[PDB]
Amino acid sequence: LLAYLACEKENWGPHLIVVPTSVLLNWEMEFKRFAPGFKVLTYYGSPQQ
DNA sequence: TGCACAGGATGTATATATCTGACACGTGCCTGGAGACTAGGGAGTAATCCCCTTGGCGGTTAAAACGCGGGGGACAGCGCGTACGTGCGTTTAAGCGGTGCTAGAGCTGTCTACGACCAATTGAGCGGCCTCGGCACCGGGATTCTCCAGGGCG
Known part of the structure; x- marks a missing residue:
């Protein structure tokens, strides 16, 4: 759907x-793996990262 | 002539009468002790409701806890010299005995403003409420601000 x-x-x-x-x-x-053309971030290291 | 003595001429602690100061005892007028009446302030109870707990699993995060390097700052050792410690003689001035005063401290009538005590009104101040513009937190970006490596310089 997003793609x-x-x-x-x-x-x-x-x-x-x-x-x-x-x-x-x-x-x-x-x-x-699926739909490579998307720019995706993540969330780790709440205080600093 | 050189010498010991008998008595006067001065000291000196010793014992006696004498001068403050503080404890001890005998009063009478502003205190306490006590008796009765009023009453509102204190002891006691009936809901109540309202925020405050009960007990412990897990998942995850931010804060607490540990561990090492070393850099600089606490800290011991030691020499210096001038800044007070110590000891004299010389002076200015308080302690103290005594004096003449006064002007302000200190206890007592008058009344008179004037504030204590008590009904009547209310309105300005307190419980309740529900919003929005100032506030909380953080990105963007410029700015400063410190840390480290030559090198030109000793």
Whole structure:
């Protein structure tokens, strides 16, 4: 769906996903596996990183 | 002539009468001791409600805890000299005995403002409420600010 929004319309935008702490990496690895053309960040190191 | 003595001519602690100071005892007028009436302030109870707990699993984070390098600052050793410690003689001035005063300190009537005590009104101040503009927190970016490596210089 997120990849369909890029081809169908011109809307990209910053998105947000809320994932449990265990599956946090599976969405990044899944974003490199599936649909490489997206720019994805992650969240670690609350006080500093 | 050189010498010991008997008595006067001065000291000196010794014993006696004498001068303050403080403890001890005998009063009578402003205190306490006590008796009765009023009453409102204190002891006692009936809900109450309201925030404050009970007990312990896990997941995760921010804060607490440990560990080593070493850099600089606490700290011991030691020499110097001038700044007070110590000891004299010389002076200015307080302690103290005594004096003449006064002007302010100190106890007592008058009344008179004038504040203590008590009804009537209310309005300005307190419980309740519900908003929004100032406030909380952080990005963007410029600015300063300290840390480290030559090198030109000793």
